[PDB]
Amino acid sequence: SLLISYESDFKTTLEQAKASLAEAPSQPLSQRNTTLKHVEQQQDELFDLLDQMDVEVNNSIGDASERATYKAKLREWKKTIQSDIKRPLQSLVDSGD
Protein backbone atom coordinates (compact mmCIF):
# COMPACT_ATOMS: atom_id res chain seq x y z
CA SER A 1 0.00 0.00 0.00
CA LEU A 2 1.08 3.64 -0.34
CA LEU A 3 0.86 4.08 3.42
CA ILE A 4 3.23 1.21 4.06
CA SER A 5 5.61 2.57 1.42
CA TYR A 6 5.76 5.89 3.29
CA GLU A 7 6.27 4.27 6.70
CA SER A 8 9.20 2.22 5.47
CA ASP A 9 10.68 5.26 3.68
CA PHE A 10 10.32 7.28 6.89
CA LYS A 11 12.03 4.65 9.04
CA THR A 12 14.90 4.08 6.57
CA THR A 13 15.45 7.80 6.05
CA LEU A 14 15.42 8.44 9.81
CA GLU A 15 18.00 5.69 10.31
CA GLN A 16 20.26 7.10 7.55
CA ALA A 17 19.96 10.64 8.92
CA LYS A 18 20.82 9.54 12.45
CA ALA A 19 23.89 7.67 11.19
CA SER A 20 25.18 10.66 9.20
CA LEU A 21 24.60 12.94 12.20
CA ALA A 22 26.51 10.48 14.41
CA GLU A 23 29.47 10.60 11.98
CA ALA A 24 29.44 14.38 11.58
CA PRO A 25 31.31 15.30 14.81
CA SER A 26 34.39 13.41 13.56
CA GLN A 27 34.58 15.34 10.28
CA PRO A 28 36.61 18.52 9.61
CA LEU A 29 34.23 21.49 9.31
CA SER A 30 34.16 21.87 5.52
CA GLN A 31 33.08 18.23 5.07
CA ARG A 32 30.92 18.47 8.17
CA ASN A 33 29.06 21.38 6.58
CA THR A 34 28.21 19.17 3.60
CA THR A 35 27.12 16.26 5.81
CA LEU A 36 24.86 18.48 7.92
CA LYS A 37 23.16 19.92 4.82
CA HIS A 38 22.39 16.34 3.81
CA VAL A 39 20.98 15.64 7.28
CA GLU A 40 18.89 18.81 6.96
CA GLN A 41 17.54 17.64 3.62
CA GLN A 42 16.62 14.28 5.15
CA GLN A 43 14.95 16.06 8.07
CA ASP A 44 12.80 17.86 5.47
CA GLU A 45 12.03 14.56 3.71
CA LEU A 46 10.88 13.18 7.07
CA PHE A 47 8.43 16.05 7.54
CA ASP A 48 7.35 15.58 3.91
CA LEU A 49 6.67 11.91 4.57
CA LEU A 50 4.67 12.74 7.71
CA ASP A 51 2.52 15.10 5.61
CA GLN A 52 1.95 12.36 2.99
CA MET A 53 1.05 9.84 5.69
CA ASP A 54 -1.43 12.25 7.35
CA VAL A 55 -3.19 12.68 4.01
CA GLU A 56 -3.15 8.96 3.22
CA VAL A 57 -4.40 8.00 6.66
CA ASN A 58 -7.17 10.58 6.29
CA ASN A 59 -8.09 9.18 2.86
CA SER A 60 -7.80 5.43 3.37
CA ILE A 61 -8.57 4.63 7.01
CA GLY A 62 -12.29 4.99 7.72
CA ASP A 63 -12.54 3.39 11.17
CA ALA A 64 -12.55 6.21 13.75
CA SER A 65 -10.63 4.20 16.36
CA GLU A 66 -8.02 2.88 13.93
CA ARG A 67 -7.56 6.40 12.56
CA ALA A 68 -6.92 7.69 16.10
CA THR A 69 -4.28 4.98 16.55
CA TYR A 70 -2.52 5.90 13.34
CA LYS A 71 -2.72 9.56 14.27
CA ALA A 72 -1.12 8.93 17.66
CA LYS A 73 1.72 7.02 15.98
CA LEU A 74 2.36 9.86 13.49
CA ARG A 75 2.38 12.39 16.33
CA GLU A 76 5.02 10.31 18.14
CA TRP A 77 6.96 10.10 14.85
CA LYS A 78 6.96 13.88 14.61
CA LYS A 79 8.36 14.02 18.16
CA THR A 80 11.00 11.51 17.08
CA ILE A 81 12.22 13.79 14.29
CA GLN A 82 12.57 16.42 16.98
CA SER A 83 14.35 14.18 19.50
CA ASP A 84 16.52 12.15 17.13
CA ILE A 85 17.39 14.69 14.41
CA LYS A 86 16.51 18.29 15.21
CA ARG A 87 17.79 18.43 18.79
CA PRO A 88 21.08 16.54 18.19
CA LEU A 89 21.75 18.56 15.02
CA GLN A 90 21.05 21.83 16.81
CA SER A 91 23.32 20.81 19.70
CA LEU A 92 26.14 19.91 17.29
CA VAL A 93 25.99 23.21 15.38
CA ASP A 94 25.48 25.42 18.47
CA SER A 95 27.48 23.63 21.17
CA GLY A 96 29.86 21.43 19.21
CA ASP A 97 33.01 22.74 20.87
Side-chain angles (χ1 to χ4, degrees), residues 7-62 64-66 68-70 72-74 76-89 91:
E7 292 192 352
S8 181
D9 189 355
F10 183 95
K11 294 168 188 175
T12 296
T13 299
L14 175 70
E15 179 188 302
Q16 293 166 351
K18 288 171 67 161
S20 292
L21 194 53
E23 287 169 337
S26 73
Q27 301 170 357
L29 298 180
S30 188
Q31 175 189 196
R32 189 182 304 183
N33 172 81
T34 304
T35 300
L36 298 186
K37 286 182 213 181
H38 187 243
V39 172
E40 285 143 23
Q41 176 189 115
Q42 286 181 314
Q43 179 189 120
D44 297 342
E45 292 166 11
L46 291 177
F47 282 108
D48 281 347
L49 282 154
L50 287 189
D51 289 356
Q52 294 167 343
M53 288 184 289
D54 284 338
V55 167
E56 187 66 15
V57 165
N58 199 52
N59 288 347
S60 293
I61 319 285
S65 285
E66 177 165 271
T69 293
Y70 242 104
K73 187 171 74 180
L74 291 176
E76 182 68 16
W77 284 10
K78 192 178 188 182
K79 294 169 58 184
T80 303
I81 299 178
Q82 298 162 346
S83 68
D84 290 19
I85 300 310
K86 212 157 176 301
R87 187 178 294 128
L89 174 56
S91 172

